Amino acid sequence: MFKTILLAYDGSEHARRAAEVAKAEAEAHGARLIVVHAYEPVPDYLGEPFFEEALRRRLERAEGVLEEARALTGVPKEDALLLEGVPAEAILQAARAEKADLIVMGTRGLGALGSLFLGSQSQRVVAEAPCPVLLVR
Amino acid sequence: MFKTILLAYDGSEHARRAAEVAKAEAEAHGARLIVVHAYEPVPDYLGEPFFEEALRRRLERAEGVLEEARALTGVPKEDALLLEGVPAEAILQAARAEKADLIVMGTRGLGALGSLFLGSQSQRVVAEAPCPVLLVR
């Protein structure tokens, strides 16, 4: 059987630190490490040609952030997932689908709303995760 | 150098599950596991002989809960600590003093006030911990 560590990464300093923690946990447990970056879609009230230009830049940056996480953790490309949607929901859906044993994530980052206690996306994952959550500042 | 995993234990089902997680983390990392149980003191407005009888029962139960955690994790007696005071503050003071690398704790338990999102003591530890926190339901 194998254990799976899921890292939520958004390019924030919190997430870089979470990446170092998740790499060490996967190595210590002999577990598979899956890295996920989730991005919200460009809003569709933008008109031509702005929508299309924003769609291209948004995806290119999202892929640049996920490539960074793959470079910091060393996981194969198939294990670095790019999900479009509400971040916490993407993370929780990946954790369920991958039968994750632990989700490692920064205390803050991942979305636009949060407090100095937790970002709104980390708080939703802590409330609904199907496995233990390792929070990293 | 050595890594230290600190387990907060209160005898709740959350804490029993956290104990299984903390035992596996210490084994996987080759880390020292310190188990802490914190209890609040008997209130001193109780009169004689009630105060003294409550003092004796409270300490005996606190030691029974900590012995349970030592039996579930296998740590030596010197590594199972019994602290009297506000739970989260005892936990955070132990984590600082023991240079903890991770605190593993249930999402709920440890005190008298909490919500269905987190107990008030887990929330304070998440807000102030000197290291990453691994929350376990």
| CATH number of the domain within which A86 lies | 3.40.50.620
Q: Could you tell me which residues are beta bridge partners of residue A135?
A: A105, B133
Residues flagged as binding site of A for ATP: 8, 37-38, 106, 108-109, 111, 120-122, 124
Domain count, chain A: 1
Which residue among A21, A25, A135 places its CB closest to the CB of B126?
Answer: A135
Sign of CA dihedral B102, B24, A9, A75: positive
Query: Looking at beta carbons, which residues of chain B come within 8 Å of A28?
Result: 25, 28-29
Question: Strand, coil or helix: what is B134?
Answer: strand
Give resolution, Å, one decimal.
Answer: 1.6
Are the Cβ atoms of B123 and A133 closer than 8 angstroms? no
What is the rounded distance in angstroms from the CA atom of residue A28 to the CA atom of residue A69? 19
Q: Residues near A133 by Cβ (< 8 Å), separated by ≥ 6?
A: A102, A103, A104, A105, A125, A126, B134, B135
Which residue among A123, A132, A137 places its CB closest to the CB of B136?
Answer: A132
Q: Residues near A34 by Cβ (< 8 Å), separated by ≥ 6?
A: A4, A5, A6, A7, A75, A79, A80, A81, A94, A98, A100
Which residue among B127, B132, B134 places its CB closest to the CB of A117?
Answer: B127
Q: Which two tokens stand for residue A110?
A: 């991942």
What is the rounded distance in angstroms from the CA atom of residue A9 to the CA atom of residue A127? 18
- Which residue range is the domain that position A24 belongs to? 1-137
